[PDB]
Amino acid sequence: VMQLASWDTRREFWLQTDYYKQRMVGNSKADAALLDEMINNIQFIPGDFTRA
Amino acid sequence: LDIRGLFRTLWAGKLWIIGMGLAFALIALAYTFFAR
Amino acid sequence: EPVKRDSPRRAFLMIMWGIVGGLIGAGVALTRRCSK
């Protein structure tokens, strides 16, 4: 569970996927803005055992 | 109050409003260039 | 490295300054109509 919600884990995953590599335009500043948007596309919601 | 009167009152003076609203908005954008 | 600057975030200043400018211009026009 700790690795799932980690900001670091989401960053390393996108850098090695072909989905992200074909979307790089070649400008250093633009790629960083694009990458930060992808990190927020994954959301983790913790559960509660009281409500099952 | 007379809202129908009020909109007619502001209809004639719209030029005065738009002449200085943009200027007051333009008062900033230099403090932004002078801040941290 | 951060991607975007935190302050002074010009957009909010632009919007709120313009809103205040429109309000004060409408008030000044209303006063001028009674002043003429």
Q: SS3 letters for chain B?
A: CCHHHHHHHHHHCHHHHHHHHHHHHHHCCCCCCCCC
CA of A33, closest CA in chain C: separation in Å?
Answer: 6
Q: Which two tokens stand for residue A9?
A: 């884990």
* Distance (Å) from the alpha carbon of C28 to chain B's nearest alpha carbon: 8
A46 cis-preceded (ω within 30 degrees of 0): no
**Spatial separation of the C-alpha atoms in residues C33 and B12, rounded to whole Å:** 9
Closest partner residue to C29 (CB to CB) among B13, B35, B36 is B13
Between CA B36 and CA A24, with CA A27 as vertex, the angle to 5 degrees is 125
Cβ-contact C29, B20 below 8 angstroms: no
Quick one: how many helices (H) and strands (E) in chain C? 1, 0
Query: Among residues 21-40 of chain A, which lie with CB inside 8 Å of chain C?
Result: 32-33, 36
Can you tell me the distance from the alpha carbon of C14 to that of A49, in angstroms, rounded to the nearest whole number?
Answer: 48
Count CB atoms within 10 A of the CB of residue B17.
20
CA atoms within 13 A on the CB side of C20: 11
Task: Count B/C contacts: CB-CB distance under 8 Å.
Answer: 64
For chain B, the chains sharing at least 3 beta-carbon pairs closer than 8 angstroms are: C
Spatial separation of the C-alpha atoms in residues B32 and C7, rounded to whole Å: 9
Q: How was this structure determined?
A: cryo-EM
